[PDB]
Structure 1
Amino acid sequence: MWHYTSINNDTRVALDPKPNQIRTITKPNTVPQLGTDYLYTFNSQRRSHTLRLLGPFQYFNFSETDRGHPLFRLPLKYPSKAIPADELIDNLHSWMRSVHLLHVRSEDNTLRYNWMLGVYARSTNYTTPVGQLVVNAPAILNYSNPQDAFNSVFVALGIDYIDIPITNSNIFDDSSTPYNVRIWHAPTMTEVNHILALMRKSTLVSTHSSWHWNVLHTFHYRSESDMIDHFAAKILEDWRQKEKLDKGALVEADRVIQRLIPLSSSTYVQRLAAIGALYPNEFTENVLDLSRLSTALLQLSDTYYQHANDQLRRLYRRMYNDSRTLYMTQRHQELLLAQITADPNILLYPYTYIFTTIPTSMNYISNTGQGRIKHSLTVTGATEHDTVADIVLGQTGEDVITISMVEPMSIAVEDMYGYVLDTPTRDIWPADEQIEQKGDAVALYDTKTSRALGMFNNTVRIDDLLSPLLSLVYRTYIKGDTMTMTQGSLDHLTLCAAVDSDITFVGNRMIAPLPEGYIPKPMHRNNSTMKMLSLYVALKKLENFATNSYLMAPDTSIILLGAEREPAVNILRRFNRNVSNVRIIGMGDRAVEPNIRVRVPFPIDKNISADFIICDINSYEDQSFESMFSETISVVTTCASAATRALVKINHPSEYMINSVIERLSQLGGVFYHTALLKTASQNPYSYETYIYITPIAAAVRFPFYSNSAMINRYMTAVADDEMPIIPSIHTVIKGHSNTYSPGLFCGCVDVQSAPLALSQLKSYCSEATTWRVDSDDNLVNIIARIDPARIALEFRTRSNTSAYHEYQRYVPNGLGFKVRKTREFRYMHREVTFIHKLMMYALIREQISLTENMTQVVSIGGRNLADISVVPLNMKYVVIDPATRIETLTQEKKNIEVQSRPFQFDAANMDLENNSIYLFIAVIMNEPNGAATPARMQMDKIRNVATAMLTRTNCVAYISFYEAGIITRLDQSTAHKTIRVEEGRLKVANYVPVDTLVEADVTLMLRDIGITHEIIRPSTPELIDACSNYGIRLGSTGGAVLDVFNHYSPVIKLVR
Structure 2
Amino acid sequence: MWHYTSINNDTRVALDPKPNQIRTITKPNTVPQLGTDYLYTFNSQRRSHTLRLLGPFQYFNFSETDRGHPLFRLPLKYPSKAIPADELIDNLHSWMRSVHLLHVRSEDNTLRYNWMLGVYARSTNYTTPVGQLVVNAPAILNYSNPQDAFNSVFVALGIDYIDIPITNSNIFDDSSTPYNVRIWHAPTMTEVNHILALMRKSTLVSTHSSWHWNVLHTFHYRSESDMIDHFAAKILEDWRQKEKLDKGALVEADRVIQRLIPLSSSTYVQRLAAIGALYPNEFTENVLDLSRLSTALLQLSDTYYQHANDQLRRLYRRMYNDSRTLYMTQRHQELLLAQITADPNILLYPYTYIFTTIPTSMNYISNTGQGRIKHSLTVTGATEHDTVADIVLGQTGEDVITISMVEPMSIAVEDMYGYVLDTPTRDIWPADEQIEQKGDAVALYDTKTSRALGMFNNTVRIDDLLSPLLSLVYRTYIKGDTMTMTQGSLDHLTLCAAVDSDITFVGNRMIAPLPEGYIPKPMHRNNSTMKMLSLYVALKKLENFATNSYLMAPDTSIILLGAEREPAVNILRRFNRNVSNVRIIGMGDRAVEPNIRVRVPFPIDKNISADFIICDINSYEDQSFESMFSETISVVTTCASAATRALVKINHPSEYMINSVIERLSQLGGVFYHTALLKTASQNPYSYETYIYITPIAAAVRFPFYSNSAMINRYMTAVADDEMPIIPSIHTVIKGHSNTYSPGLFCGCVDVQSAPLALSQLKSYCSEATTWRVDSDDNLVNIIARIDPARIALEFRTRSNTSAYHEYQRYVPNGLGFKVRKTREFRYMHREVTFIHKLMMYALIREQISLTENMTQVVSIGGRNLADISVVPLNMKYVVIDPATRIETLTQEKKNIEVQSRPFQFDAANMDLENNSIYLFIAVIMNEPNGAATPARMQMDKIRNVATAMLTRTNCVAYISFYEAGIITRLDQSTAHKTIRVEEGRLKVANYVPVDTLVEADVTLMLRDIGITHEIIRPSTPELIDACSNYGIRLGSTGGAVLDVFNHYSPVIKLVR
Q: TM-score, normalised by structure 2?
A: 0.94
Change (3 A) 1:701 1:818: same
Identity over the aligned pairs, expressed in percent? Answer: 100
How far is 1:565 from its partner?
3.4
Q: Distance in 1 between matches of 2:787 and 2:485?
A: 44
How far is 1:901 from its partner?
1.5
- The answer as to whether partners of 2:282 and 2:363 remain within 8 angstroms in 1 is no
**Range 824-833 or range 48-57, more displaced:** 48-57
Q: Distance in 1 between matches of 2:926 and 2:330?
A: 67
Q: Distance in 2 between matches of 1:836 and 1:68?
A: 70
**Range 875-884 or range 38-47, more displaced:** 38-47
| Superimposed CA distance per residue, residues 503-552 of structure 1 (whole angstroms, 9 cap, x where no aligned partner) | 23312444332222232122221121122122222222333222221222
Q: Distance in 2 between matches of 1:786 and 1:395?
A: 16
How far is 1:306 from its partner?
8.2
How far is 1:149 from its partner?
3.4
Change (3 A) 1:207 1:432: closer
Change (3 A) 1:740 1:581: same
How far is 1:369 from its partner?
0.9
Q: Distance in 2 between matches of 1:619 and 1:328?
A: 82
Change (3 A) 1:871 1:161: closer
Change (3 A) 1:506 1:755: same
Look up the SS of the partner of 1:475 in the other structure.
helix
- Count matched residues: 1057
How far is 1:319 from its partner?
4.4
Q: Distance in 1 between matches of 2:849 and 2:295?
A: 61
Q: Distance in 2 between matches of 1:524 and 1:882?
A: 53
How far is 1:231 from its partner?
4.5
- The answer as to whether partners of 1:601 and 1:638 remain within 8 angstroms in 2 is no
Look up the SS of the partner of 2:748 in the other structure.
strand
Change (3 A) 1:89 1:565: same
How far is 1:726 from its partner?
0.7
Change (3 A) 1:46 1:239: farther
**Range 313-322 or range 637-646, more displaced:** 313-322
How far is 1:665 from its partner?
1.4
- The answer as to whether partners of 1:290 and 1:296 remain within 8 angstroms in 2 is no
How far is 1:330 from its partner?
4.0
**Range 828-837 or range 444-453, more displaced:** 828-837
> Structure 2: which 5+ runs fail to align?
none
**Range 781-790 or range 314-323, more displaced:** 314-323
Look up the SS of the partner of 2:367 in the other structure.
coil
| Superimposed CA distance per residue, residues 425-470 of structure 1 (whole angstroms, 9 cap, x where no aligned partner) | 2222222211211111111111111111110011111111221222
Look up the SS of the partner of 1:585 in the other structure.
strand
How far is 1:673 from its partner?
1.5
**Range 405-414 or range 617-626, more displaced:** 617-626
| Superimposed CA distance per residue, residues 839-886 of structure 1 (whole angstroms, 9 cap, x where no aligned partner) | 221111122221221122222212222111222122222222233333
**Range 728-737 or range 196-205, more displaced:** 196-205
- The answer as to whether partners of 2:13 and 2:212 remain within 8 angstroms in 1 is yes
Change (3 A) 1:694 1:308: closer
Change (3 A) 1:314 1:993: closer
- The answer as to whether partners of 2:164 and 2:180 remain within 8 angstroms in 1 is yes
Change (3 A) 1:75 1:683: closer
- The answer as to whether partners of 2:913 and 2:954 remain within 8 angstroms in 1 is no
Change (3 A) 1:289 1:305: farther
- The answer as to whether partners of 1:44 and 1:80 remain within 8 angstroms in 2 is no
How far is 1:705 from its partner?
1.6
How far is 1:718 from its partner?
1.3
Q: Distance in 1 between matches of 2:363 and 2:467?
A: 47
> Structure 1: which 5+ runs fail to align?
none
| Superimposed CA distance per residue, residues 1007-1049 of structure 1 (whole angstroms, 9 cap, x where no aligned partner) | 3322232222211110111111121211111111112222221
Q: Distance in 1 between matches of 2:360 and 2:583?
A: 82
Look up the SS of the partner of 1:353 in the other structure.
coil
| Superimposed CA distance per residue, residues 319-355 of structure 1 (whole angstroms, 9 cap, x where no aligned partner) | 4555444454344444444333333344334444444
Look up the SS of the partner of 2:554 in the other structure.
coil
- The answer as to whether partners of 1:915 and 1:955 remain within 8 angstroms in 2 is yes
Q: Distance in 2 between matches of 1:185 and 1:796?
A: 72
**Range 230-239 or range 356-365, more displaced:** 230-239
How far is 1:364 from its partner?
2.9
Look up the SS of the partner of 1:290 in the other structure.
coil
Q: Distance in 1 between matches of 2:979 and 2:280?
A: 53
Q: Distance in 2 between matches of 1:43 and 1:492?
A: 39
| Superimposed CA distance per residue, residues 193-218 of structure 1 (whole angstroms, 9 cap, x where no aligned partner) | 45444444545444444443343434
- The answer as to whether partners of 1:908 and 1:946 remain within 8 angstroms in 2 is no
Change (3 A) 1:18 1:482: same
Partner of 2:777: 777
- The answer as to whether partners of 2:284 and 2:365 remain within 8 angstroms in 1 is no
- Over the aligned positions, Cα root-mean-square deviation in angstroms equals 2.9
Change (3 A) 1:325 1:979: closer
Look up the SS of the partner of 1:960 in the other structure.
strand
Change (3 A) 1:80 1:878: same
How far is 1:702 from its partner?
0.7
Change (3 A) 1:454 1:75: same
Change (3 A) 1:515 1:848: same
How far is 1:287 from its partner?
13
**Range 812-821 or range 160-169, more displaced:** 160-169
Partner of 2:645: 645
How far is 1:246 from its partner?
3.3
How far is 1:634 from its partner?
1.1
- The answer as to whether partners of 1:405 and 1:827 remain within 8 angstroms in 2 is yes
Partner of 1:419: 419
Q: Distance in 2 between matches of 1:217 and 1:850?
A: 80
- The answer as to whether partners of 2:239 and 2:281 remain within 8 angstroms in 1 is no
**Range 162-171 or range 291-300, more displaced:** 291-300
Q: Distance in 1 between matches of 2:669 and 2:4?
A: 100
Q: Distance in 1 between matches of 2:321 and 2:896?
A: 58
- The answer as to whether partners of 1:304 and 1:312 remain within 8 angstroms in 2 is no
Q: Distance in 1 between matches of 2:1042 and 2:303?
A: 60
How far is 1:585 from its partner?
0.9
- Counterparts of residues 442-841 of structure 1 (less than 5 Å): 442-841=442-841
Q: Distance in 2 between matches of 1:590 and 1:313?
A: 77
Change (3 A) 1:60 1:839: closer
How far is 1:903 from its partner?
1.7
Partner of 2:137: 137
- The answer as to whether partners of 1:729 and 1:744 remain within 8 angstroms in 2 is yes
How far is 1:312 from its partner?
4.4
- The answer as to whether partners of 1:688 and 1:711 remain within 8 angstroms in 2 is yes
How far is 1:9 from its partner?
3.8
- The answer as to whether partners of 1:773 and 1:816 remain within 8 angstroms in 2 is yes
- The answer as to whether partners of 2:563 and 2:591 remain within 8 angstroms in 1 is yes
Change (3 A) 1:973 1:223: closer
- The answer as to whether partners of 1:289 and 1:776 remain within 8 angstroms in 2 is no
- The answer as to whether partners of 1:565 and 1:593 remain within 8 angstroms in 2 is no
| Superimposed CA distance per residue, residues 38-86 of structure 1 (whole angstroms, 9 cap, x where no aligned partner) | 3343344163343343444333333322223233233333444333233
Look up the SS of the partner of 2:497 in the other structure.
helix
Q: Distance in 2 between matches of 1:963 and 1:316?
A: 65
How far is 1:657 from its partner?
0.8
How far is 1:5 from its partner?
2.3
| Superimposed CA distance per residue, residues 783-828 of structure 1 (whole angstroms, 9 cap, x where no aligned partner) | 1121211111122221111222232223322233221122211112
Q: Distance in 2 between matches of 1:669 and 1:198?
A: 114
How far is 1:124 from its partner?
3.0
How far is 1:276 from its partner?
4.0
- The answer as to whether partners of 2:913 and 2:952 remain within 8 angstroms in 1 is no
| Superimposed CA distance per residue, residues 733-753 of structure 1 (whole angstroms, 9 cap, x where no aligned partner) | 111221111211122121222
- Counterparts of residues 848-927 of structure 1 (less than 5 Å): 848-907=848-907, 910=910, 912-927=912-927
Q: Distance in 1 between matches of 2:1054 and 2:318?
A: 76
Q: Distance in 1 between matches of 2:1026 and 2:618?
A: 29
- The answer as to whether partners of 1:977 and 1:1038 remain within 8 angstroms in 2 is no
How far is 1:999 from its partner?
2.4
- The answer as to whether partners of 1:552 and 1:576 remain within 8 angstroms in 2 is yes
- The answer as to whether partners of 2:621 and 2:628 remain within 8 angstroms in 1 is no
- The answer as to whether partners of 1:286 and 1:814 remain within 8 angstroms in 2 is no
Change (3 A) 1:204 1:528: closer
Look up the SS of the partner of 1:614 in the other structure.
strand
Change (3 A) 1:175 1:14: same
Change (3 A) 1:163 1:557: closer
